[PDB]
Amino acid sequence: HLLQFRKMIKKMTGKEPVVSYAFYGCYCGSGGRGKPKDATDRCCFVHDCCYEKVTGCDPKWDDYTYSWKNGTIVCGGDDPCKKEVCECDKAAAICFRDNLKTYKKRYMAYPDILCSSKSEKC
Amino acid sequence: HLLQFRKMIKKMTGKEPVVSYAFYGCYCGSGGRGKPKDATDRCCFVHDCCYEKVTGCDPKWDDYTYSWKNGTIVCGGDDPCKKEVCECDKAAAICFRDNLKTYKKRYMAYPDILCSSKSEKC
Amino acid sequence: HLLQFRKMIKKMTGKEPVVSYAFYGCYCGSGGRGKPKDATDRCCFVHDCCYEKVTGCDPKWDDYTYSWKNGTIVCGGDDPCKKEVCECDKAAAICFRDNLKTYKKRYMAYPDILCSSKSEKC
Amino acid sequence: HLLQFRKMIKKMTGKEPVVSYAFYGCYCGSGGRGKPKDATDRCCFVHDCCYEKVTGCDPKWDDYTYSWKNGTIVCGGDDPCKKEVCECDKAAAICFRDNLKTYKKRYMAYPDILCSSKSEKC
Ligand SMILES: CCCCCCCCO[C@@H]1O[C@H](CO)[C@@H](O)[C@H](O)[C@H]1O
Numbered sequence: 027h028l029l030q031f032r033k034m035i036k037k038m039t040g041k042e043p044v045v046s047y048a049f050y051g052c053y054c055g056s057g058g059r060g061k062p063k064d065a066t067d068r069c070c071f072v073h074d075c076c077y078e079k080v081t082g083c084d085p086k087w088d089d090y091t092y093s094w095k096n097g098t099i100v101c102g103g104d105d106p107c108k109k110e111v112c113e114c115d116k117a118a119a120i121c122f123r124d125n126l127k128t129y130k131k132r133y134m135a136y137p138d139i140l141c142s143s144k145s146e147k148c
Numbered sequence: 149h150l151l152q153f154r155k156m157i158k159k160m161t162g163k164e165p166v167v168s169y170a171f172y173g174c175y176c177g178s179g180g181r182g183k184p185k186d187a188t189d190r191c192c193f194v195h196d197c198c199y200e201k202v203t204g205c206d207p208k209w210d211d212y213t214y215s216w217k218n219g220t221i222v223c224g225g226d227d228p229c230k231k232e233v234c235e236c237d238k239a240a241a242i243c244f245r246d247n248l249k250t251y252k253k254r255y256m257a258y259p260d261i262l263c264s265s266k267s268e269k270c
Numbered sequence: 271h272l273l274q275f276r277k278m279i280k281k282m283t284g285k286e287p288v289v290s291y292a293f294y295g296c297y298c299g300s301g302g303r304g305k306p307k308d309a310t311d312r313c314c315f316v317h318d319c320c321y322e323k324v325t326g327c328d329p330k331w332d333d334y335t336y337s338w339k340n341g342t343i344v345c346g347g348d349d350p351c352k353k354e355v356c357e358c359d360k361a362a363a364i365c366f367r368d369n370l371k372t373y374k375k376r377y378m379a380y381p382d383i384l385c386s387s388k389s390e391k392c
Numbered sequence: 393h394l395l396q397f398r399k400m401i402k403k404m405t406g407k408e409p410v411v412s413y414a415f416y417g418c419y420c421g422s423g424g425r426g427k428p429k430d431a432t433d434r435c436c437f438v439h440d441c442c443y444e445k446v447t448g449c450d451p452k453w454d455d456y457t458y459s460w461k462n463g464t465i466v467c468g469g470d471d472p473c474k475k476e477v478c479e480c481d482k483a484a485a486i487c488f489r490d491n492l493k494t495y496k497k498r499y500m501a502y503p504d505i506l507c508s509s510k511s512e513k514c
């Protein structure tokens with residue numbers, strides 16, 4: 027679920043996801059188009075590619091089980107699909123954390139009309 | 149150029165493109181996500197696939213030359229790229245015209261958050 | 271803080287504020303222009319007028335103290351400014367609740383370009 | 393009309409208005425909030441104040457008549473209202489031209505949530 031993803035980003039980043047990542051660049055918002063603006067935007071591009079590979083369940087609205095075993099997110103459960111989407115999220119949150127240093131405010135709330143016409147492939 | 153595309157849609161549809169198509173469904177707005185809501189939305193999905201195939205120029209901001217020879221849009225010029233994008237637009241405008249009968253007001257200004265998580269491939 | 275405001279709207283409305291109100295009409299989004307589209311949009315117009323009257327602090331990013339004493343939001347604290355902005359929020363959330371019946375989906379994510387040219391005065 | 397305004401900015405600035413000014417700062421986008429970010433943003437703030445003074449017609453969607461007599465935009469017509477809005481536009485385009493030197497890319501597509509809470513008065 028996006029609300030679980032949100033909690034992962036918050037803890038690993040220290041920022042309010044809805045304000046800082048929900049509309050960042052060209053891929054963090056809903057969908058995605060053109061070429062990723064930067065490192066953080068690439069995180070969203072990859073996460074987008076991740077959700078598309080998920081077939082058995084709904085990555086957006088399906089709840090998955092996870093824990094913070096030793097400061098790190100650990101995805102569990104017997105459902106390989108929901109765990110699959112949990113890993114997509116875990117990887118994205120860590121991706122945001124690693125590239126926090128290159129985070130540009132000019133990119134949050136970035137207008138999609140300004141995104142390149144040719145989109146990068148997963 | 150989107151402003152030329154707009155003139156094609158207006159003449160072939162009789163509607164103000166900025167109001168009636170700029171935010172229609174899941175693909176007519178900027179970018180696109182999930183599954184096309186309907187016929188008209190499919191027009192935008194295809195047009196989106198069209199602009200992605202264009203490599204040599206900018207489909208969004210590059211001006212191309214065309215004429216209305218015999219009530220039909222005719223794309224000209226020596227530039228194969230700009231003409232290529234002109235055909236993308238010409239096809240979309242005609243696509244809107246043919247499916248005008250299935251146009252649903254409930255779909256203009258459609259919230260992207262409600263679009264499917266798995267997007268259709270070109 | 272907007273994140274506290276968001277919690278008020280959620281509890282009083284039952285809807286995710288970021289999806290259902292962050293882009294509603296002509297005033298709920300950032301800023302505001304033209305004439306309020308409907309009742310819900312008027313809630314935002316008034317809330318906008320409320321934040322403009324606040325002088326001593328930052329209504330958007332300043333945290334205020336409040337409680338849910340008896341199913342109703344109660345604003346506290348010794349700071350008259352922060353409490354002032356808490357009341358702006360409290361009033362807006364209740365405003366959304368009372369007009370939930372007239373909430374129109376066609377208005378969430380409403381394009382600002384379509385908003386009237388002459389804006390109503392506070 | 394905004395489409396005429398757009399042609400003025402293009403000729404006087406050499407930039408695509410929809411990309412470079414439609415989302416610049418805190419006032420160039422639709423509506424406006426807080427304090428102008430810079431000189432260019434002030435152009436939009438003033439233009440905003442200009443459109444609000446117009447009463448007899450629609451500055452956004454009403455067409456006015458003008459010409460480029462001697463490299464300079466000249467507003468004509470017998471309609472004082474439409475001419476009134478033509479001057480608002482003419483002044484803004486010139487304003488953009490004069491401050492092109494201070495144009496900051498970090499400000500195009502600027503997130504309105506980051507705009508000051510107290511808006512400047514016309
Ligand atoms: C009125 C309800 C407010 C709930 C909190 C919403 C927080 C997100 O707010 C949104 O941020 C976007 C970019 O970040 C902007 O483009 C939108 O104008 C703004 O509404």
Ligand SMILES: CCCCCCCCO[C@@H]1O[C@H](CO)[C@@H](O)[C@H](O)[C@H]1O
Binds near residue numbers: 395414415419
């Ligand atoms: C589609 C036409 C866009 C023309 C470029 C406009 C440059 C920014 O111009 C702004 O446009 C707003 C709407 O976005 C208007 O409400 C404002 O009057 C104006 O400041």
